[PDB]
């Protein structure tokens, strides 16, 4: 009866400003935040413009807690995870969701 409240597929507006990116197995996920509406958008960008980039690699070598970045103060992921659940996260492509989902599955571990 309620129906579709809003369309999941939405265009990447120019209002959004790049805040940070995450690199995993050579595959980069650029996280941008729409300041005007206070929403979040994702794109395939790996430019050195970012002033906040963190790397994550194979869990078996357990690099996350070793030589690589040991800063767990990245509360941005907690807010991003909440945005997905609450629904303030959307993008113009369905393909990136399936590929991105693989990283989300690993975060479920801890």
d(C-alpha 83, C-alpha 89), whole Å: 6
d(C-alpha 16, C-alpha 41), whole Å: 7
Residue 9 within any structural domain of the chain: no
Residue 86 within any structural domain of the chain: yes
What strand order describes the sheet that includes 39-43? 39-43, 27-34, 17-24, 53-56
Count of the separate structural domains present in the chain: 1
- β-pairing, 53-56 vs 17-24, is parallel
Residue 10 within any structural domain of the chain: no
Give, rounded to a whole angstrom, the gap between the first and last alpha carbons of the chain. 38
d(C-alpha 33, C-alpha 16), whole Å: 5
Residue 76 within any structural domain of the chain: yes
Residue 56 within any structural domain of the chain: yes
Please give the residue range of the domain that contains residue 72: 17-107
d(C-alpha 100, C-alpha 48), whole Å: 21
Q: Say if residue 58 is exposed, middle or buried (CB neighbours under 10 Å; 0-12, 13-18, 19+).
A: exposed
């Amino acid at each position: 009866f309620i129906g579709d409240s809003q369309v999941f597929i939405e265009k990447r507006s120019k209002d959004s400003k790049f805040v940070f990116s995450i690199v995993y197995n050579g595959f980069t996920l650029g996280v941008w935040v729409d300041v005007n509406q206070g929403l979040m958008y994702i794109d395939t960008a790996h430019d050195p413009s970012t002033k906040n980039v963190y790397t994550l690699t194979t869990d078996d070598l357990n690099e996350n807690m070793m030589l690589i970045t040991n800063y767990k103060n990245n509360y941005h992921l907690r807010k991003l995870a909440s945005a997905f659940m609450n629904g303030y996260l959307r993008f113009d492509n369905q393909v990136i969701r399936n590929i991105a989902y693989e990283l989300f599955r690993k975060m479920r571990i801890q």
